[PDB]
Design a binder for this molecule. Structure first.
Ligand SMILES: [Ca+2]
Ligand SMILES: [Ca+2]
Ligand SMILES: [Zn+2]
Ligand SMILES: [Zn+2]
Length: 270
């Protein structure tokens, strides 16, 4: 029997791919999520993991019997190297456009962020993405019968987005939420409390927390699977229900607590 994935798994440690629910499949690594949402008209790939992950994601898509060439749209959570790292590689393999909100586009074209990213100084360089479609902050990405709805989630980064859609097993349909990271982490310079350096940024983070908390959610997944306890819910170590309609609310509430802890840490230092 396979032993499954650890909660502190390396970002590049391989995961056997497996159904989340209905036509939503997990194709990421043990430490970093990626999802494939499938239809007989084509597929949507959600996230690209770490600049090293192109081949594992492609192998996992094929392991499930899907063709990368049948992917018609790529979306992602946020423009850090551990989630956007293999976007260019995946666009070449699929021929699919990458959808991105305005505040992520320059980062995707450069392959590095600028100082608007809290984690600017610890960024690793990425391959630029050649074909980007600018996504409105409440935009819908449609491929055949598939429809993924964007929820703009700035805070962890300027360009972060959460995604939501419905997947069905027969007549039993679930609202899936791939909620962006909500951790208030940074490099050694950035201060969330320095509004003059980034006006409105922290207010936008608080707004993101409230919006995520309010989403209709049946099944939550997060870019770092441990942030939503994914490996306690699917795979060999599963011991808790996959569906939990309180998950988004608890996720955002915990994130708010941690954000306020970060603000207390900033108040304590010069
Ligand atoms: Ca419902
Ligand atoms: Ca996360
Ligand atoms: Zn990040
Ligand atoms: Zn991350």
């Amino acid at each position: 029997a396979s032993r499954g994935c650890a909660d502190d798994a390396g970002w590049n440690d391989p995961a056997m791919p497996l159904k989340v629910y209905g036509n939503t499949w997990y194709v990421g690594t043990c430490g970093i999520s990626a999802l494939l949402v499938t239809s007989d008209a084509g597929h949507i790939l959600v996230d690209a993991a770490t600049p090293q992950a192109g081949p594992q994601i492609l192998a996992n898509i094929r392991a499930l019997g899907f063709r990368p060439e049948d992917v018609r749209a790529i979306v992602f959570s946020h423009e850090h190297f551990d989630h956007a790292g293999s976007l260019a590689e995946l666009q070449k393999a699929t021929g699919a456009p990458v959808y991105a909100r305005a505040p992520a586009i320059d980062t995707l074209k450069r392959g590095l962020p600028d100082r608007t990213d809290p984690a600017f100084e610890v960024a690793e360089p990425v391959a630029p993405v050649a074909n980007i479609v600018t996504l409105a902050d409440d935009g819908v990405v449609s491929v055949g019968p598939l429809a993924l709805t964007a929820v703009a989630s700035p805070g962890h980064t300027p360009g972060g987005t959460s995604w939501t859609w419905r997947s069905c097993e027969g007549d039993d349909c679930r609202q899936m939420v791939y909620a962006d990271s909500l951790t208030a982490i940074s490099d050694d310079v950035f201060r969330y409390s320095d509004d003059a350096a980034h006006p409105g940024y922290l207010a936008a983070f608080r707004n993101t927390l409230a919006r995520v908390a309010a989403l209709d959610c049946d099944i939550l997944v997060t870019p770092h699977p441990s942030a939503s306890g994914l490996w306690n819910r699917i795979g060999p170590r599963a011991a808790a229900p996959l569906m939990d309609t309180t998950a988004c609310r608890r996720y955002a509430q915990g994130a708010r607590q941690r954000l306020e802890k970060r603000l207390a840490e900033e108040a304590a230092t010069s």
